[PDB]
Amino acid sequence: TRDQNGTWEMESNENFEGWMKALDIDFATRKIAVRLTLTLVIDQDGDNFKVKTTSTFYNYDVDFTVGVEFDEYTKSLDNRHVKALVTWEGDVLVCVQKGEKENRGWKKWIEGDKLYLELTCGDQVCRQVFKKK
Numbered sequence: 388t389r390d391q392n393g394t395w396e397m398e399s400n401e402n403f404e405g406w407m408k409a410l411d412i413d414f415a416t417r418k419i420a421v422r423l424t425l426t427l428v429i430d431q432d433g434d435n436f437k438v439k440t441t442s443t444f445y446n447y448d449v450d451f452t453v454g455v456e457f458d459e460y461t462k463s464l465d466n467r468h469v470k471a472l473v474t475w476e477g478d479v480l481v482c483v484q485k486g487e488k489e490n491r492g493w494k495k496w497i498e499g500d501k502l503y504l505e506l507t508c509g510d511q512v513c514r515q516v517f518k519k520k
């Protein structure tokens with residue numbers, strides 16, 4: 388299904404550290420964030436997405452429209468300018484962030500009652516799994 392609406396609680400996080408390191412997130416921030424349980428709140432209406440990523444210490448928000456390129460400044464993440472584009476490949480939602488880092492972006496999809504998120508940067512892949520709250 389393409390329906391990713393919901394409140395999603397993290398149950399698994401693979402190689403989060405390797406991915407953050409590939410983005411050059413500073414050593415001290417990584418120590419805090421690496422084992423936090425993340426919650427994703429996704430509001431999806433047609434192409435319009437509002438995604439909130441929350442944890443005890445860090446709260447992020449991004450809004451986008453599927454099919455519409457948007458320039459992003461990655462703020463409290465790695466502080467870079469990228470050109471972002473989110474599209475569908477079948478029922479996989481694919482984000483490409485063009486800029487300095489190669490292979491930068493993510494893919495999100497649903498299997499049963501679970502949301503899967505694959506984050507990529509350089510040669511690093513982080514895989515996260517969430518259950519619907």
Ligand SMILES: *C/C=C(C)/C=C/C=C(C)/C=C/C1=C(C)CCCC1(C)C
Nearest residue numbers: 420438440441442445446447464495
């Ligand atoms: C569609 C799912 C998306 C866009 C989720 C993106 C998640 C992040 C950019 C997460 C960033 C971080 C936190 C919320 C705290 C943990 C460490 C960070 C900085 C990687």
